Amino acid sequence: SRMPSPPMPVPPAALFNRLLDDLGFSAGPALCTMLDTWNEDLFSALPTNADLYRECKFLSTLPSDVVEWGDAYVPERTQIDIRAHGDVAFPTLPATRDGLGLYYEALSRFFHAELRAREESYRTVLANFCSALYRYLRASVRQLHRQAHMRGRDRDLGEMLRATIADRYYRETARLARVLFLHLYLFLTREILWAAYAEQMMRPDLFDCLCCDLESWRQLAGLFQPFMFVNGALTVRGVPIEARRLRELNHIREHLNLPLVRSAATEEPGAPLTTPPTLHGNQARASGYFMVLIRAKLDSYSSAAPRLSFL
Numbered sequence: 001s002r003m004p005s006p007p008m009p010v011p012p013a014a015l016f017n018r019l020l021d022d023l024g025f026s027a028g029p030a031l032c033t034m035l036d037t038w039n040e041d042l043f044s045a046l047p048t049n050a051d052l053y054r055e056c057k058f059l060s061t062l063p064s065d066v067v068e069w070g071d072a073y074v075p076e077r078t079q080i081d082i083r084a085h086g087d088v089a090f091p092t093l094p095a096t097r098d099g100l101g102l103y104y105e106a107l108s109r110f111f112h113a114e115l116r117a118r119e120e121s122y123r124t125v126l127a128n129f130c131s132a133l134y135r136y137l138r139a140s141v142r143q144l145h146r147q148a149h150m151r152g153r154d155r156d157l158g159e160m161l162r163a164t165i166a167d168r169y170y171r172e173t174a175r176l177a178r179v180l181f182l183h184l185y186l187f188l189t190r191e192i193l194w195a196a197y198a199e200q201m202m203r204p205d206l207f208d209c210l211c212c213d214l215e216s217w218r219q220l221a222g223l224f225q226p227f228m229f230v231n232g233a234l235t236v237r238g239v240p241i242e243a244r245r246l247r248e249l250n251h252i253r254e255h256l257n258l259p260l261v262r263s264a265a266t267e268e269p270g271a272p273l274t275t276p277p278t279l280h281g282n283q284a285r286a287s288g289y290f291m292v293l294i295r296a297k298l299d300s301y302s303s304a305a306p307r308l309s310f311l
Contacts, residue, residue, distance in 0.1 A: 002083050006075030006128040009135040012172050019129060019176055023082070028179040031186065031256065035287035037279050038252055043289045045222035046185065047112055049119050053300035056123065058130040059173075061302040063165040067158075070134035077128065080121050083187075086113030090195075093203050100206060100308055107226040111192055115184075122184045129176050130169075137164050177294050189223045190258055197228045197259035207231050208264075213238060213307035221249055223258065231264035232311040243268045248277035252286070 004022035007015060020026050053059055057069040091106035141160045148155055200207060207229035214220055214236045234241050243266050250260045251274040260273055
């Protein structure tokens with residue numbers, strides 16, 4: 001449902017499974033696990049939208065703040081549509097090659113508009129999960145207070161509550177947030193990109209001789225690629241990217257169910273389009289770049305255009 005019902009207070013492992021259900025993301029953990037086996041920075045170029053969480057009190061690192069918010073917050077699944085759209089027009093491929101620059105730009109702007117619009121719903125979903133999380137913690141603490149006092153040891157409930165929040169709440173929220181936002185990004189980029197891929201496939205006249213020069217590899221490794229057919233040449237600061245690198249990147253894109261980035265000029269005749277990269281444990285993992293992305297959202301409360309030519 002575009003508007004899943006607010007979860008019920010349950011043990012973190014049940015709350016987590018419940019989240020996968022609300023998102024139809026049973027694959028989430030497995031996708032999460034894959035992000036470790038890779039070293040690619042697929043998330044840095046993504047908008048953090050940290051501003052959307054700046055006033056989210058359930059993210060306050062002050063346990064007393066979480067107590068105030070949580071006691072008062074009544075979860076609502078009214079204004080929720082996890083597949084909400086923005087009103088920026090989905091760009092159509094230009095009639096001529098001259099419009100390719102405006103297109104790359106317009107498609108990125110569309111993506112951002114869609115993301116921000118859909119993100120407001122994901123924020124409500126997080127609030128609901130944090131609320132059920134807070135309530136389970138409050139219920140456990142009430143029960144411990146009962147048993148203890150029953151044994152002559154009467155402790156301060158309020159102190160107990162604030163301590164478990166410090167102890168468990170932030171760690172649990174982070175775990176939920178990771179999969180929640182991985183769903184936001186994966187589902188949206190897939191949705192937009194598969195539709196645009198199909199169209200670009202049908203426009204050989206724009207992409208057969210397209211040469212695109214990027215400032216960095218990070219700009220190409222990022223999930224959202226406006227161009228999926230760059231057949232004339234694909235270079236970074238003038239140097240032709242390596243065939244093997246593109247192949248490995250494509251293996252990742254493929255394993256995330258995203259369309260591949262095609263380059264006649266790059267691909268080696270006789271080689272596959274994808275190739276499993278060898279993990280280098282002495283290097284940062286894709287999972288690392290993702291956590292930096294999510295942490296910008298979580299820490300909020302308590303805190304170039306490609307050169308295009310043709311052959």
